[PDB]
Write an enzyme that holds these catalytic residues in place. Structure first.
Site, mmCIF file in Angstrom:
data_model
loop_
_atom_site.group_PDB
_atom_site.id
_atom_site.type_symbol
_atom_site.label_atom_id
_atom_site.label_comp_id
_atom_site.label_asym_id
_atom_site.label_seq_id
_atom_site.Cartn_x
_atom_site.Cartn_y
_atom_site.Cartn_z
ATOM 1 N N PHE A 12 42.589 13.061 9.779
ATOM 2 C CA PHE A 12 41.511 14.007 9.513
ATOM 3 C C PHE A 12 41.296 14.216 8.021
ATOM 4 O O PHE A 12 40.200 13.943 7.525
ATOM 5 C CB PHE A 12 41.792 15.342 10.215
ATOM 6 N N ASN A 60 42.011 24.509 0.422
ATOM 7 C CA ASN A 60 42.412 25.904 0.328
ATOM 8 C C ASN A 60 42.403 26.500 1.727
ATOM 9 O O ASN A 60 41.808 25.949 2.656
ATOM 10 C CB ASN A 60 41.485 26.688 -0.606
ATOM 11 N N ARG A 119 49.251 17.646 1.621
ATOM 12 C CA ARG A 119 49.043 17.742 3.056
ATOM 13 C C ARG A 119 48.506 16.426 3.597
ATOM 14 O O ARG A 119 47.966 15.607 2.853
ATOM 15 C CB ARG A 119 48.080 18.887 3.401
ATOM 16 N N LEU A 142 37.260 22.079 7.444
ATOM 17 C CA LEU A 142 37.254 22.178 5.991
ATOM 18 C C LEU A 142 35.902 22.604 5.434
ATOM 19 O O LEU A 142 35.815 22.922 4.243
ATOM 20 C CB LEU A 142 37.671 20.840 5.371
ATOM 21 N N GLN A 190 45.423 15.683 1.620
ATOM 22 C CA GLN A 190 45.346 16.485 0.408
ATOM 23 C C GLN A 190 46.433 16.040 -0.556
ATOM 24 O O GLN A 190 47.624 16.147 -0.246
ATOM 25 C CB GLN A 190 45.487 17.974 0.730
ATOM 26 N N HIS A 194 37.150 25.270 2.376
ATOM 27 C CA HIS A 194 37.634 24.610 1.175
ATOM 28 C C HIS A 194 36.440 24.099 0.380
ATOM 29 O O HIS A 194 35.421 23.699 0.951
ATOM 30 C CB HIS A 194 38.577 23.452 1.520
ATOM 31 N N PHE A 233 41.500 17.308 -1.031
ATOM 32 C CA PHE A 233 41.642 16.769 0.319
ATOM 33 C C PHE A 233 40.515 15.784 0.591
ATOM 34 O O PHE A 233 39.373 16.186 0.832
ATOM 35 C CB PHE A 233 41.644 17.895 1.351
#
Lengths: 84, 44, 533, 100, 100, 27, 320, 244
Positions: free
Chosen positions: H115, H157, H110, H177, H118, H181, H168
């Site tokens: 921002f 996640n 990702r 996040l 990942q 995550h 990430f």
């Protein structure tokens, strides 16, 4: 005479008053519980009217009772409409 | 087993099993003499 | 400094216990630890003692191990002091030496908490350790119940009809039973005035109440929890249950309908007492005259001994398995009625912070509970007397006997068991034995229980209120006969179902040796002496 | 006997403010509602630890198994399966009507 | 307190003499010359020594269960000192005696 | 010796002999 | 570095049960004919020494009896309770003849002078009181400990009064002024029990820190016995020098008095119906024959041990 | 003894009823705060009574500080450090991905618009790959090392128990996040390469990079979770030399 086994009563008390005073005291206690939940939520959508009513700024919704605003939680639809 | 009842419901082993058989288990209650008998008797 | 008097006992005891907690908590602390948190340890200990008082499983998983052991040890000391203090208080209140209302109420609360802890212990031990009733014993009792039910040609009680002919009159009788309690017209409280308003609502509209009652009998198998309390009779405590008023109205009218249904089908044979026909003094007179008007009853010349046995059933309530009761009541009544009976006892006993579900005991706050205790005692009469001797009691089902008539003197003397009377659980049997059968029973009793020192005489319990001349004379033979009779009685009843105690029982032997026959029916101690003797 | 949503929110706020043991204090707030009614409405309907879900295959099998074996004691059946007695009786009658 | 002039009735002169142990009361003059050891083995030895047509059936044949009072024996089970008052036998006897 | 703060509330296996007895009861 | 002597070990031979409260203290009749236990059931129970049968049981203390002592030259029983009271009992009439009142808090221990016949009572108000026996008057009040005084020793040698309190200090008192002369701060933990040797003009102190042997009269610090480092509630020493240290975890540790060598470490069992927390020793005491050991356990039992007479020096070796 | 003992006059259908019934029929685990079962069974009467106090058990990823894996991403050899003190499940997931090639030889899962990026997931969706247990490891954000700052590597996640291999690195502080995550740690090397991969072109539908920072290799310069695995293996083999 059982002086030490008498029921609970002290001089200079006044007695139990009328049920209307208990009803408005219960309404004040429910108002304080509603204010405690409002302060826990920290929601700016709650407002107090000039006549002493509840305003939902997230809906522009009037409430005569605090339970009307408490159940007004459609509310999220007009909240998402105002978020746009 | 033939289901043990709640009338007995025997928890715990016996004290000879717990302490061993050689220990003199003294489960003693109640006075062997009345209160009127003087412990350390007076002269008479 | 002031003395620690009676009003200052518990406060100084808890103060010294707290000081002992401080001295026994300051001493395993190593170097360091600024947050000693002795106030937090006091809160943990107070919560532990409160949860032991509440029978709540108290556990803080963040708690050091020897501190936890010291907490458990101190709670053990406080619990032992509490239980022993309640023991001395109950002893002196039973003596009546101490007259104090607060001591009586504190002791009653202590005993209520201890008994409910024991009952929750018994219920959890039952559900964890399985059924005490085994399987084949209950199957044999079920089969014998089916055999006697087919023997008596019993048409079963159906579901209550929607248009019953005297449902209004049975509702009137149930309203009489319910309004018997609130006949004082006192200040009451909100729940009592609510129950009176529900009573007057059912009084105004009978039909909606009948429809709701049949609706709950069809559908409702989940009920509200029941409160519990006691009264002290200064020798023992007796419980009072607390049921929802709508369920009370439903069970009262249901009880009236099943009692009239059992009257119409003649379900209960007339050996079962308390019957509605007679007062218990007239029942005493009937039992005495039934012992009187038997044939050749006082003539003990050839060893035809007269054995009077009065006993009880002891644990007749707490060992009733509800699934077995469901299977037995599906035989008697409609299956939805039996499911209502089964789900009625599966409710939660409550007293303040006492909350546990009843599952193997019976509840005596139910209206039909009297009927099912009499039904349970009836099948105990079937178990003890046997089906042939019970048929000889009741006669044919088409032409039943009364309480104390038979078909013939031969129908008396065909069995040694002559006369029977069950008063709920108090069992009163008159036997007439022969010398050879008495000697054979004594021989088998001594075969199982040998006694070369002749110690069976001193284990007897006699009527101490009568004089020594009035008492039955304790030689070896008659006391061995009575112990053999009680042994024979105890060999029939299995300990899974119930027990009968020798200490609670009284067995009197009339013979040529002993001219008096003693018993005690209700509160009436009766001594029988024949005019021949 | 009726239960408004305003009364339910008042009961939930009174439980979250006053804990669980205090019930006459809650019944002072709730007009024409006794403490037994408040406790039954909380622990029977308004408790968040009530499994207000749908039945799994394992839950249906255990419900049918226990109600087949030991009959009609839902206050015994429901702590084994984690539901409440009204939920387990209702779903067992639903499964009975599905079988019939 | 050397200055108080209040006198309780438990502060009166009473029991002012002290009795002492005579030779019948195990006086310290004979405690020294007496040796308690062989006294203790002779008393323990004494305690160890003194430690010791038509025919019917049987009339009782019309029952379902025979000989149910077979393994019923109390003996030392009540004499087992359980030091737990939840499971104390005296406590159980107390509950059945004082609860009907 | 870390002591968590005390929080006050004031301020299951079943035997299959039940099932065996129930099955014998149905039979 | 001397090789230590071999005291023979001990073995448990009888266990007495019957109290419904914790056996707080054990006293023995000085002629060694019977003994007596003051319990936390507020029961003063005379037991037979030989047969172990319950001779008598007495009540009267409204709170827990902390101390029981029988006078060695007078036919009197002195029982201090936690009800801020001490009862003097005439055993000829078996009655409380005298009352000692005046402690502001619960009394935890008492002692008597063997020749002067004067009473000292240490209590929860961080003080001891010295009472005349016959007139029941506190002619002295020893103070200076900041915490509650756990134990007191009254000896005829100098100094007469040895007070061990919970403020990690031991006070050694000049009796004729009623004033403390020696104060020992050397224990890191609470001084809960002290034991005097009857002949060597020395004593020892048990604490959760360690055990400390000293010497009269200045309290000169002789030895530091490490080990058995639990909350030592009670201590006794034999005429042989067999030191028995009993703590609140239920373990007995047995030592030589001279070398301090731990020769025995025995943990006793508990009652069948009892918790594992109910193993805590409140009074260890030898008999007057110095042959039987009476331990007052927290599962409301009295465990009396005999000498392990079958032991030899090579079956039970002396380490170092 | 016998089933027909304490029984007489047995019925027939009773006998085939019983016939039908018979025809059908630890070293490092000391946690010192104990189990609450003993205190529960002492304070209530609804359970089996316990008189012996039982201690609570506890491996629980007994690690040594933080590990550092130099992932050879498409922007360069960027070293990402995962802290097992911050999140041991995230460290186990990242170290197991680096060992069993759910991160090595994988692409970037990702990338958001400056921002968070990942990478190290074999699925390439945002939370894919393989953790230590086979299933994805538990997701929990630490307060000492959260999903804030620059280069802060978090096991990406969509919720709890969903972080498997996607780590990430967040180029800016964000609460999205946080607590969703598991924040494994921070990037210890190649910070400019991580910033260029976060500022690289990404399609925001799945929020994934077209210029995917693809970790071809994962050279473990330090590994706290593999150190925990080696410590658990050493603690097993210390007792397996005498009790295999």
């Amino acid at each position: 005479m059982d002086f030490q086994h008498r029921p609970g009563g002290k001089t200079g008390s006044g007695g139990v008053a009328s049920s209307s005073e208990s009803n408005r005291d219960r309404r004040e206690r429910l108002r304080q519980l509603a204010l405690e939940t409002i302060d826990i939520n920290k929601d700016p959508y709650f407002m107090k009217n000039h006549l002493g009513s509840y305003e939902c700024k997230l809906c522009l919704t009037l409430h005569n009772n605090e339970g009307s605003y408490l159940a007004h939680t459609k509310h999220q639809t007009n909240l998402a409409r105002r978020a746009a | 087993m033939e289901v043990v009842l709640h009338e007995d419901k025997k928890y715990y082993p016996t004290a000879e099993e717990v302490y061993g058989p050689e220990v003199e288990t003294i489960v003693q209650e109640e006075d062997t003499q009345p209160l009127t008998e003087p412990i350390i008797k007076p002269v008479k | 400094a002031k003395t620690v008097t009676k009003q200052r006992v518990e406060s100084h005891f808890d103060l010294e216990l707290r000081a002992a907690v401080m001295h026994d908590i300051l001493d395993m602390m190593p170097e360091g630890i600024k947050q000693n948190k002795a106030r937090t340890i006091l809160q943990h200990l107070s919560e532990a003692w409160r949860c032991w008082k509440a029978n709540i499983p108290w556990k803080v998983p963040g708690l050091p191990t020897p501190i936890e052991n010291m907490i458990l040890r101190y709670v053990k000391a406080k619990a032992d002091w509490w239980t022993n203090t309640a023991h001395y208080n109950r002893e002196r209140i039973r003596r009546g030496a101490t007259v104090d209302k607060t001591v009586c109420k504190k002791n009653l609360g202590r005993l209520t908490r201890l008994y409910l802890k024991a009952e929750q212990e018994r219920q959890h031990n039952y559900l964890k350790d399985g059924p005490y009733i085994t399987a084949e014993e209950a199957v044999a009792v079920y089969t014998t119940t089916v055999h006697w039910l087919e023997s008596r040609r019993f048409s079963p009680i159906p579901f209550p009809p929607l248009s019953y002919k005297h449902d209004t009159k049975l509702l009137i009788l149930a309203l009489e039973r319910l309004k018997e309690a609130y006949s004082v017209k006192s200040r009451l409280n909100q729940s009592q005035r609510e129950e009176l308003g529900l009573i007057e609502q059912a009084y105004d509209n009978p039909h909606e109440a009948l429809s709701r009652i049949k609706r709950h009998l069809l559908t409702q198998r989940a009920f509200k929890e029941v409160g519990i309390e006691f009264m002290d009779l200064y020798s023992h405590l007796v419980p009072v249950y607390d049921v929802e008023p709508l369920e009370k109205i439903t069970d009262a009218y249901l009880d009236q309908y099943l009692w009239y249904e059992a009257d119409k089908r003649r379900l209960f044979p007339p050996w079962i007492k308390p019957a509605d026909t007679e007062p218990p003094p007239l029942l005493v007179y009937k039992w005495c005259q039934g012992i009187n008007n038997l044939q050749d009853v006082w003539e003990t010349s050839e060893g035809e001994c007269n054995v009077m046995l009065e006993s009880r059933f002891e644990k007749m309530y707490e060992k009733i398995d509800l699934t077995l009761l469901n299977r037995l009541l599906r035989l008697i009544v409609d299956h939805n009625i039996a499911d209502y009976m089964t789900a009625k006892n599966n409710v939660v006993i409550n007293y303040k912070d006492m909350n546990h579900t009843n599952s193997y005991g019976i509840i005596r706050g139910l209206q039909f509970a009297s009927f099912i205790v009499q039904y349970y005692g009836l099948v105990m009469d079937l178990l003890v007397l046997g089906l042939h001797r019970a048929s000889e009691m009741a006669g044919p089902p088409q032409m039943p006997n009364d309480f104390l008539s038979f078909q013939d003197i031969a129908t008396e003397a065909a069995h040694p068991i002559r006369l029977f009377c069950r008063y709920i659980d108090r069992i009163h049997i008159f036997f007439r034995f022969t010398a050879d059968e008495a000697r054979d029973l004594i021989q088998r009793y001594l075969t199982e229980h040998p006694d070369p020192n002749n110690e069976n005489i001193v284990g007897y319990n006699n009527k101490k209120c009568w004089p020594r001349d009035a008492r039955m004379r304790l030689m070896k033979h008659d006391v061995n006969l009575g112990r053999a009779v009680f042994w024979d009685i105890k060999n029939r009843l299995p300990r899974s179902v119930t027990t009968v105690q020798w200490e609670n029982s009284f067995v009197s032997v009339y013979s040529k040796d002993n001219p008096n026959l003693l018993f005690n029916m209700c509160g009436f101690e009766c001594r029988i002496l024949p005019k021949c003797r | 006997g009726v239960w408004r949503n305003t009364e339910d929110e008042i009961l939930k706020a009174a439980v979250m403010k006053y804990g669980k043991n205090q019930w006459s204090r809650i019944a002072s707030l709730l007009h024409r509602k006794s403490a037994k009614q408040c406790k039954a409405r909380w622990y029977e309907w308004l408790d968040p630890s009530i499994k207000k879900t749908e039945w799994s295959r394992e839950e249906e099998e255990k419900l049918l198994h226990l109600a087949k074996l030991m009959p009609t004691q839902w206050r015994t059946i429901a702590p084994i399966i984690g539901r409440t007695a009204a939920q387990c009786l209702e779903h067992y009658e639903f499964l009975l009507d599905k079988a019939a | 307190s050397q200055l108080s002039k209040q006198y309780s009735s438990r502060d009166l002169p009473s029991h002012t003499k002290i009795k002492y142990r005579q030779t019948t009361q195990d006086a310290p003059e004979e405690v020294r010359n007496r040796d308690f050891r062989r006294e203790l083995e002779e008393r323990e030895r004494a305690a160890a020594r003194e430690k010791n047509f038509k025919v019917k059936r049987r009339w009782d044949d019309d029952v379902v269960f025979k000989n149910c009072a077979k393994g019923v024996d109390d003996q030392k089970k009540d004499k087992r000192f359980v030091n737990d008052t939840l499971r104390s036998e005296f406590h159980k006897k107390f509950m059945e005696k004082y609860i009907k | 010796w870390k002591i968590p703060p005390c929080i006050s509330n004031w301020k299951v296996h079943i035997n299959e002999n039940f099932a065996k007895l129930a099955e014998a009861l149905y039979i | 570095m001397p090789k230590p002597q071999w005291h023979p070990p001990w073995k448990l031979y009888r266990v007495i049960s019957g109290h419904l409260g914790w056996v707080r203290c054990i006293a023995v009749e000085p002629g060694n004919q019977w003994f007596v236990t003051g319990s936390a059931d507020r029961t003063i129970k005379i037991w037979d020494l030989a047969s172990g049968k319950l001779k008598l049981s007495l009540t009267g203390h409204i709170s827990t009896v902390r101390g029981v002592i029988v006078s060695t030259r007078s036919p009197y029983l002195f029982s201090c309770g936690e009800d801020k009271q001490v009862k003097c009992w005439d055993l000829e009439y078996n009655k409380v003849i005298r009352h000692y009142h005046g402690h502001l808090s619960a009394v935890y221990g008492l002692d008597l002078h063997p020749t002067i016949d004067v009473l000292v009572t240490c209590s929860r108000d961080s003080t001891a009181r010295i009472w005349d026996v016959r007139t029941k008057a506190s002619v002295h009040t020893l103070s200076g400990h900041t915490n509650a005084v756990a134990t007191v020793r009254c000896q005829a040698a100098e100094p007469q009064i040895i007070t061990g309190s919970h403020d990690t200090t031991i006070r050694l008192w000049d009796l004729v002024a009623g004033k403390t002369r020696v104060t020992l701060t050397n224990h890191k933990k609470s001084v809960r029990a002290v034991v005097l040797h009857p002949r060597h003009y020395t004593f020892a102190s048990g604490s959760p820190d360690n055990i400390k042997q000293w010497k009269f009269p200045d309290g000169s610090f002789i030895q530091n016995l490490s080990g058995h480092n639990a909350i030592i509630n009670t201590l006794t020493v034999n005429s042989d020098g067999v030191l028995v240290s009993g703590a609140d975890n239920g373990t007995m540790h047995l030592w030589d008095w001279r070398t301090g060598y731990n020769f025995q470490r025995v943990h006793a069992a508990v009652q069948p119906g009892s918790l594992d927390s109910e193993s805590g020793i409140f009074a260890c005491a030898f008999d007057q024959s110095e042959s039987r050991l009476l331990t007052a356990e927290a599962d409301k039992t009295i465990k009396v041990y005999r000498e392990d007479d079958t032991a030899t020096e090579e079956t039970h070796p002396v380490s170092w | 003894q016998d089933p027909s003992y304490y029984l007489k006059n047995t019925n027939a259908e009773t006998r085939e009823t019983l016939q039908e019934l018979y025809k059908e029929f630890d070293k490092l685990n000391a946690a010192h705060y104990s189990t609450g079962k003993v205190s529960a069974s002492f304070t209530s009467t609804a359970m089996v009574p316990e008189t012996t106090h039982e201690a609570a058990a506890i491996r629980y990823q007994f690690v040594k500080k933080k590990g550092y894996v130099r992932l050879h991403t498409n922007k360069g050899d960027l070293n990402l450090e995962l802290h097992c003190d911050l999140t041991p499940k995230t460290c186990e997931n990242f170290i197991r991905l680096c060992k069993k090639h759910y991160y090595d030889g994988t692409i970037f899962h990702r990338s958001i618009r400056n921002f968070v990026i990942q990478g190290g997931d074999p699925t390439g969706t945002g939370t894919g790959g393989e953790s230590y247990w086979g299933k994805p490891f538990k997701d929990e954000f630490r307060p000492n090392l959260s999903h804030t700052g620059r280069g802060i590597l978090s096991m990406a996640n969509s919720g709890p128990n969903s972080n498997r291999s996607q780590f990430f690195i967040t180029f800016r502080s964000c609460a999205y996040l946080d607590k969703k995550h598991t924040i494994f740690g921070r990037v210890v090397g190649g910070f400019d390469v991580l910033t260029a991969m976060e500022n690289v072109e990404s399609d925001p539908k799945t929020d994934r990079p077209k210029e995917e920072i693809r970790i071809d290799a994962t050279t473990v310069f330090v590994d706290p979770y593999e150190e925990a695995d080696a410590q658990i293996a050493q603690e097993r083999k210390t007792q397996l030399k005498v009790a295999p």
